[PDB]
Amino acid sequence: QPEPDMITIFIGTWNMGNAPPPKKITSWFLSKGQGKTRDDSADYIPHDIYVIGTQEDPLSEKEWLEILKHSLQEITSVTFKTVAIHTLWNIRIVVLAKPEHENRISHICTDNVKTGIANTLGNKGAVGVSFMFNGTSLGFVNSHLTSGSEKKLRRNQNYMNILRFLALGDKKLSPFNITHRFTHLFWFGDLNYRVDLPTWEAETIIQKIKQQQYADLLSHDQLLTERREQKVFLHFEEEEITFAPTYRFERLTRDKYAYTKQKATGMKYNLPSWCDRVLWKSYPLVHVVCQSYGSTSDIMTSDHSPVFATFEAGVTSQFVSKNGPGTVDSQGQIEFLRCYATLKTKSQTKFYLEFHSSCLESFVKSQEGENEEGSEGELVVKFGETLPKLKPIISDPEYLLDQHILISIKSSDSDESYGEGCIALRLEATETQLPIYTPLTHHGELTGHFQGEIKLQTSQ
Numbered sequence: 182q183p184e185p186d187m188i189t190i191f192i193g194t195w196n197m198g199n200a201p202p203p204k205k206i207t208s209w210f211l212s213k214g215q216g217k218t219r220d221d222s223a224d225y226i227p228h229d230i231y232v233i234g235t236q237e238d239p240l241s242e243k244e245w246l247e248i249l250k251h252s253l254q255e256i257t258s259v260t261f262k263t264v265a266i267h268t269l270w271n272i273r274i275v276v277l278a279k280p281e282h283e284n285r286i287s288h289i290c291t292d293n294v295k296t297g298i299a300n301t302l303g304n305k306g307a308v309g310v311s312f313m314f315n316g317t318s319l320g321f322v323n324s325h326l327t328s329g330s331e332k333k334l335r336r337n338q339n340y341m342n343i344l345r346f347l348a349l350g351d352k353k354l355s356p357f358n359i360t361h362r363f364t365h366l367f368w369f370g371d372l373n374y375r376v377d378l379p380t381w382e383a384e385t386i387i388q389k390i391k392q393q394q395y396a397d398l399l400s401h402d403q404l405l406t407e408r409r410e411q412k413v414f415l416h417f418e419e420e421e422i423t424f425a426p427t428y429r430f431e432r433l434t435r436d437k438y439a440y441t442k443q444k445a446t447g448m449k450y451n452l453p454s455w456c457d458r459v460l461w462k463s464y465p466l467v468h469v470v471c472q473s474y475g476s477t478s479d480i481m482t483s484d485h486s487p488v489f490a491t492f493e494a495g496v497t498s499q500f501v502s503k504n505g506p507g508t509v510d511s512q513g514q515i516e517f518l519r520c521y522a523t524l525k526t527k528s529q530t531k532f533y534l535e536f537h538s539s540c541l542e543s544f545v546k547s548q549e550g551e552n553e554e555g556s557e558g559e560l561v562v563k564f565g566e567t568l569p570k571l572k573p574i575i576s577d578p579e580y581l582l583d584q585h586i587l588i589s590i591k592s593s594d595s596d597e598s599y600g601e602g603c604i605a606l607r608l609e610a611t612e613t614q615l616p617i618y619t620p621l622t623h624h625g626e627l628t629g630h631f632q633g634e635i636k637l638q639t640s641q
């Protein structure tokens with residue numbers, strides 16, 4: 182039985198509105214309703230992995246797991262295995278996988294982050310799961326961010342707290358947050374960003390929705406605008422939205438948006454909004470293709486509609502040669518030439534690099550770089566040809582060209598990372614000097630850039 186080089190992943194997010202689900206929720210897992218939907222001819226074909234995020238979930242873990250498993254069995258005639266389930270308050274994540282994957286999945290982590298302080302601590306935050314699937318690291322975050330049209334900045338703060346403090350993936354990657362620890366990272370939930378138009382325009386918005394004319398609404402969606410201004414979700418992707426706003430509906434129909442201020446809303450308006458979202462971030466030059474992104478039309482117990490997204494995702498095998506794992510492969514090397522970091526910091530410490538990768542036996546520390554002043558004020562840290570030669574555990578090009586090098590630039594004075602990035606080894610050529618580049622972030626904000634050239638030697 183051959184190891185896969187692609188899998189399909191289902192991501193679902195649903196704010197259940199504290200109500201039990203209806204007896205049939207199969208449309209969700211079939212990617213049927215509005216938006217980019219799945220072809221009928223694929224209905225019986227199971228996804229490899231199903232990741233279900235709920236918010237305002239009133240069910241026990243047992244109750245929800247029974248509903249999910251029975252739903253997937255009815256669709257696929259497959260009895261899915263539970264990889265992980267984690268709940269914070271009424272925020273939950275379930276990961277299910279085909280039984281044939283049970284001995285491909287390992288290093289399962291779970292964690293949660295509670296957002297806010299005092300007043301604002303007690304119901305919002307995030308849960309997450311990570312694991313390895315053969316040689317590929319996968320992370321999944323379900324977040325329920327702060328509600329309300331006039332709290333977009335709070336949502337952005339909630340995002341930064343979650344990516345700083347959620348402890349998933351390989352703890353040895355100590356300089357790196359979740360935005361760098363995984364081959365593929367999916368972040369979804371009730372992110373609670375709103376369509377930022379005047380209250381007086383509610384009926385006009387509803388009109389536009391009935392005409393399926395979303396362009397003038399999406400141009401005011403706070404998550405798209407905050408992302409465009411680099412305030413949140415830097416370096417994440419989202420598929421184009423082609424489905425109606427998923428909030429706020431009257432329950433038991435989808436015919437009516439309930440937007441007017443009520444005591445139950447704290448006297449706030451809930452203009453129709455795309456609260457419920459799926460985003461991803463994959464390492465450079467790894468295959469990832471969104472094959473569905475939409476909302477169901479027939480699940481009406483909540484004031485939100487369920488959202489689905491599905492993905493093709495490239496995966497690699499658990500590589501064994503005669504040499505690595507447990508020795509180097511003298512036939513392999515990675516050389517960095519003419520490298521420099523450009524940093525936005527105002528500090529004057531020396532910096533060194535760390536190179537982290539599962540193709541190395543352990544991370545590698547460089548010598549300190551040489552600080553210069555850039556033309557437009559910036560700090561430039563020059564490494565020249567001083568960087569260590571990296572010795573990968575396996576030299577086979579079928580392995581090595583699929584790997585990635587994480588880079589952290591650290592202060593000599595504090596050993597704190599000032600910036601993190603990632604370089605793909607999927608090069609156009611081996612034994613050839615080629616340009617490399619990554620942006621550098623810290624706490625998911627842009628802090629600089631790293632650029633130079635690489636020279637990769639494989640056994641071919």
Ligand SMILES: C(=C/c1ccccc1)/Nc1nc2ccccc2[nH]1
Nearest residue numbers: 405406407408409410415416417418
């Ligand atoms: C281009 C413009 C845009 C971005 C966010 C929101 C709206 C428009 N899209 C985009 N450029 C990227 C570069 C690196 C990683 C991801 C990226 N996504």
